[PDB]
Amino acid sequence: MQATIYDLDGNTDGEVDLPDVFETPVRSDLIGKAVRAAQANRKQDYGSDEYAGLRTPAESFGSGRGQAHVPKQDGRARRVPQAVKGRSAHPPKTEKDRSLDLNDKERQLAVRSALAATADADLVADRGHEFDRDEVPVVVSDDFEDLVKTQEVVSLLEALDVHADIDRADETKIKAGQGSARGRKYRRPASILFVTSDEPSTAARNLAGADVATASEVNTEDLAPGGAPGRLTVFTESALAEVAER
């Protein structure tokens, strides 16, 4: 198919052929499997102290004093799982493999499928993104990589009728639960992904919910956050070309 290139003013500047990978059939089950694997592989090993509750010479008195055969020390119960201050019976273990394996072919197919989901305007709108376009992904010229100011990227996205997505992501949610105590108090909607070629866009990175990536290493996660296909993306002309052989 054909993809319309846009200049830094938001006007048309020709068109190049939209590569073959954008016609790869959308496969949400494989995309979801790849995101599930990526999210799991960054999780840290944890577990309670191997000796927690075992640091006592507590012994059971056995039969005779009208008491249950529970290990006691200084007339206080210890060690056993049913005892207060006792060991955890089946606790989280550090030795546990918390990683998920994925075949390269299966993962590569998911990258290709997620890239393709980016080319369907209805799937992108189904995902939740707010925009006023027909043609998707938004293809921009390589001169996008030379932009320095964030405010300049706002102007271009306003000219491209695609800024409404950043307004959607300009609302932080204060999560329910104790994640707050561990550093995970806030979260926000995922907005526009910016795929460049040389270096990730320093100019676009701070935009609400925006994620910046490069064509050589853009993965399933930035292409489909949370496993949900169809992210409103914007490619650089050279990025569109390089993302073809992935």
Partner: protein, 119 residues
Amino acid sequence: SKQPDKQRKSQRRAPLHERHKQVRATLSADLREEYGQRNVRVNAGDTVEVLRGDFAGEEGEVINVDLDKAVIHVEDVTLEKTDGEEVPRPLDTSNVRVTDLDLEDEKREARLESEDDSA
């Protein structure tokens, strides 16, 4: 650190010289233009305007700056005890704005006027 526990810890357990940054208030439009700073370390000679509490809108001289409790006393910003004595209501400098400065110290004036440093 991004961790909340460590963040609050470093603020409460901060040494005395590092507690100066805990008693900083925003400068007025004129003072921001004059010295090239957005905020300043509140001194016991400065005039301040209350922007947030129950005393919002009131002006007054800064009578005391407690570094340990990271709080300030401003003139007439008081509470009336049961006996009748008017005791100061401590204010967080974050809810306050500096209108006039005490430049009796040569070092503070020089620090405010230098483009490479800040006060």
